[PDB]
Amino acid sequence: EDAELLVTVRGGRLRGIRLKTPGGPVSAFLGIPFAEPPMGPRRFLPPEPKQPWSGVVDATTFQSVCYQYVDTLYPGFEGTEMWNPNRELSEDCLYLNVWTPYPRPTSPTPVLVWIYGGGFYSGASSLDVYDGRFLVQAERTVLVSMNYRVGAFGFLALPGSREAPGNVGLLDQRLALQWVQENVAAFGGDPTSVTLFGESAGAASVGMHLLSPPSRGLFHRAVLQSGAPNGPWATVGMGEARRRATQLAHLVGCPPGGTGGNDTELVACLRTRPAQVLVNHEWHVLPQESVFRFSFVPVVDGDFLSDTPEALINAGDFHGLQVLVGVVKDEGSYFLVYGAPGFSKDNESLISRAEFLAGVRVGVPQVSDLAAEAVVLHYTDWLHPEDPARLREALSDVVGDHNVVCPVAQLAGRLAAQGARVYAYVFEHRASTLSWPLWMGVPHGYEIEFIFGIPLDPSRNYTAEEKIFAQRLMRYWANFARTGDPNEPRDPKAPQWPPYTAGAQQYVSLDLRPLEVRRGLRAQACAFWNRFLPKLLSAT
Amino acid sequence: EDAELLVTVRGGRLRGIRLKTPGGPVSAFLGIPFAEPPMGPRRFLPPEPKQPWSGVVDATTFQSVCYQYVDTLYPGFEGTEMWNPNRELSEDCLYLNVWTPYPRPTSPTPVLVWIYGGGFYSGASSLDVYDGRFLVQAERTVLVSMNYRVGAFGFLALPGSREAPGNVGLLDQRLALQWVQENVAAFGGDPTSVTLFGESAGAASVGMHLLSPPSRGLFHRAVLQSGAPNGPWATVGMGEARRRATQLAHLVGCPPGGTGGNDTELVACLRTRPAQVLVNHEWHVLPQESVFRFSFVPVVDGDFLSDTPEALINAGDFHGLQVLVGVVKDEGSYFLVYGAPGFSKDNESLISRAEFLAGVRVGVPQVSDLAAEAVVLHYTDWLHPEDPARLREALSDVVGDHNVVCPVAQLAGRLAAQGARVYAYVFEHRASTLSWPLWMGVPHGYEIEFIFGIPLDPSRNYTAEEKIFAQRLMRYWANFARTGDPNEPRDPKAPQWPPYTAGAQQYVSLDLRPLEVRRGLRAQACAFWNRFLPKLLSAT
Numbered sequence A, B: 001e002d003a004e005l006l007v008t009v010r011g012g013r014l015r016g017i018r019l020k021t022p023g024g025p026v027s028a029f030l031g032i033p034f035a036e037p038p039m040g041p042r043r044f045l046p047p048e049p050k051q052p053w054s055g056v057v058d059a060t061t062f063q064s065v066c067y068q069y070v071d072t073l074y075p076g077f078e079g080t081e082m083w084n085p086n087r088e089l090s091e092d093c094l095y096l097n098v099w100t101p102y103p104r105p106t107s108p109t110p111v112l113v114w115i116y117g118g119g120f121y122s123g124a125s126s127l128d129v130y131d132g133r134f135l136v137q138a139e140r141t142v143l144v145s146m147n148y149r150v151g152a153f154g155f156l157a158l159p160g161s162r163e164a165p166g167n168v169g170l171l172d173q174r175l176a177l178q179w180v181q182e183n184v185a186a187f188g189g190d191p192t193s194v195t196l197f198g199e200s201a202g203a204a205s206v207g208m209h210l211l212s213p214p215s216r217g218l219f220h221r222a223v224l225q226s227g228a229p230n231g232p233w234a235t236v237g238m239g240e241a242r243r244r245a246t247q248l249a250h251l252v253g254c255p256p257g258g259t260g261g262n263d264t265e266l267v268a269c270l271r272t273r274p275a276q277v278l279v280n281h282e283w284h285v286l287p288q289e290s291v292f293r294f295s296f297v298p299v300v301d302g303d304f305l306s307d308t309p310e311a312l313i314n315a316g317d318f319h320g321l322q323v324l325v326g327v328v329k330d331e332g333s334y335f336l337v338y339g340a341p342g343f344s345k346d347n348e349s350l351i352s353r354a355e356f357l358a359g360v361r362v363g364v365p366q367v368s369d370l371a372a373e374a375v376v377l378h379y380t381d382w383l384h385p386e387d388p389a390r391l392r393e394a395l396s397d398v399v400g401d402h403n404v405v406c407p408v409a410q411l412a413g414r415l416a417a418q419g420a421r422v423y424a425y426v427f428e429h430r431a432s433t434l435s436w437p438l439w440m441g442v443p444h445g446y447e448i449e450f451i452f453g454i455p456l457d458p459s460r461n462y463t464a465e466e467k468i469f470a471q472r473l474m475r476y477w478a479n480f481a482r483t484g485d486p487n488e489p490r491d492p493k494a495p496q497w498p499p500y501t502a503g504a505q506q507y508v509s510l511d512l513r514p515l516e517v518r519r520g521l522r523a524q525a526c527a528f529w530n531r532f533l534p535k536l537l538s539a540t
């Protein structure tokens, strides 16, 4: 028995577990309950705090994963299954995990809080790529990762009603942040230096915590990796969320014909159906065929989000706030396999122009025919208008810039020009053990394994260059967690990471080579998405 | 007595003059009348052939310049005075010139036929830069230059009428080509090899002779130097041409206060007016403040133009035809000091962002406010959106591409893809004796000096490098006139000139350096003008 694996929080006593890294052990506490199980009558309702328990709750393994869709388009394939659930599915899933160094820090240490992505329909903090044992050992910080309700269980919204207000998944993350602010000190963590970081939908969640007033006091810094709250996929209107919720109820037999009708009878009927039944009809409520679009997503109700994310970003004071932000080299290449015509992960995807003209409608859904002609213009090399190799990566840029790159660059510039300290990066390293085809380059979400120091795992087949490269990135992220500056506090030998300003627009390239400063997060392409096309949609 | 300076044509006998070049003499016949003077009741009417005369007509000096506006914006400035008339103005101006080598060729020699430009409102074959003594002596070819009516006297059109049909200025050029087919052999020229070549509005006129059936039988090859018939300035609609004709009549006092205003009474009142009075109200007819727009231009009417130039270029067959087209490096830079705000030839024209936003409305007149923002989007550096030096060259590209570069690139692509053998060039040499400011680079029309061998004149301060450079260009144009191929027939040593096709789109940079093959005649920019902007103006 180690005296450090026994820790008492405000709810009760816990028993952690020691993990083994090549450089030392780490005390981990996996599966702490931070909310009452949202089952039965609590489905679609905001979370309630965990009632205090008697005894010692076992915290030596990851708890259950929230109910979600499971990708089966490529069985056995590691590229898709690495994000699939690794524990059993249950609505009793609201748990968090805390990693702390050994020996436990005597002084308060900055805290990192990870929010997994997964398009607000999937994800779990128990994934092997989110194993934070390598970060808290190499940088001696504290890491906390929580589970939140995805799918309809976390984002089915009947706005205005009480039985289904929506954004209950975002409230799950907020309750975990309140838990960290009240209990991370018992693990040696500094609640006055909490840094949020997330990827994809988790990055969009970090951005919505910047814009929600009740959540701002629960952290101090933010990191958004390949995601932003102002994306075309990260929010839906009240009128659309009500239509998607009513269609899901109809697909499962709610209301029973013929009874109706109001929101009270509709949600009460939804609570009687099994959880997996609701999941089996999640994708059948999307309005049209598309990629990078998800069914149940954070809504602009008016409570958690007083206005649309775009408006709050433009009318907010961001002084005294440090933000890290970046994207990968090929954001859209991952999503083309899931809908774009003529795309297969097992060939070269040398598409024809007819397939390219059709793919723009899938990549850019719900838009006028004239607006499609404008997208075809900007992303077509007119010296070689039918080269399959160029058309392939052109549509990859379309989906990447429309959903991730330009919504992120829009957010990064407005933050710096309004008082926030902003740093920008572009991840340009493809892992040697990547199972996706070559033409995808660096897919969506394949920098997470380097942030958490996965190449340090001796059971993996990474190169010696990638191990040193992962330690640089871990120190980049940890330095931002401590001082809000990724540059070394004193070390001048390493190249400098200049802040991203609204005018200069400077970012760095994260790869095996040293830092390289560049200007423009696809400024020419993103001016089409952020400036002209909105004016093209008002005059239909 | 040199018996080579007295030649008999179908009209009568002529008397030429010997002019000396550093390489030898050349016989010239300047001022041959090819039509009865269009005065009095002949104003605005098509030309009629010159009746035969008695005795010897003196052809020693250039005749009179057609009535036209004279530029007085910069008095004494050679950059503008070089295009102003050098002979006195008169309505009796329909005269042509022929240059023939000495000794006169005993074998029929291919003929080059020059059509001067100047926005269909000015110009004269008597300009010093149109001297064909060097082009004829160095390559032993027959040069023929003509005068055609400009301004209202050549292009005022009341469509459907009989006294103001329009395109009578283009009919003057046709009559001169008929004169060449009947009399160029008397000077030693081959009427079965005539090659039209013009610049600006003259280059457009060369294109309109390609699209006119009654004129296609009068030549075999074509050269369009920075000008195309499908440009937004080369033609005008029926209804607008009538409004511009009625606008001019009102400003001069037609009809008198109290009388009717049909087409017959309007022109009869116009014929009773002094020629200079009509010229003094030409620019007060344009519908708005603009540049690269002219009052009286050729009119699509169903006679000389059975349809619009763009329609005839698309539905035309051009087998058995070889064309040579091209542009200068800085087309629109010259027109910016004629209306664009913040421009001045005496400073560096470092304009502001607001001046650039207003210049697009002047450079691109009569477009929806939404259409201009698409132009602003495509022609601004979004990383340096406020740099005056970049905004200056940007607006130069806007006027250059919209009026010249893109209308020409579309024509060359349609000609090659439908039978014609097209050759494309880009002139990139700034003359060492140029008087315009340096930021204009290579302005509109400053390659004519080198084609006509002007640097060979000993009374000028051209460098020795430009003298060899001019001889290269005179041979390119002469080889095209002889065989239809600008490359040397007996030479694989010198760099070759690949034809321009609709697929590869290869062109050549003409400079002191050897030939350099490039691809794409501003493809990315011209795809916005030729393809997208029509689709946007349709949905307005």
Ligand SMILES: O=C(/C=N/O)NCCN1CCCN(CCNC(=O)/C=N/O)CC1
Pocket (backbone or CB within 6 Å): A071, A083, A117, A118, A119, A199, A200, A283, A291, A292, A293, A334, A335, A338, A444, A445
């Ligand atoms: O990868 C991440 C997060 N990484 O952290 N984002 C989700 C990527 N999605 C890509 C496209 C949508 N969708 C495909 C699966 N379902 C279907 O579209 C049709 N199924 O039948 C989900 C996967």
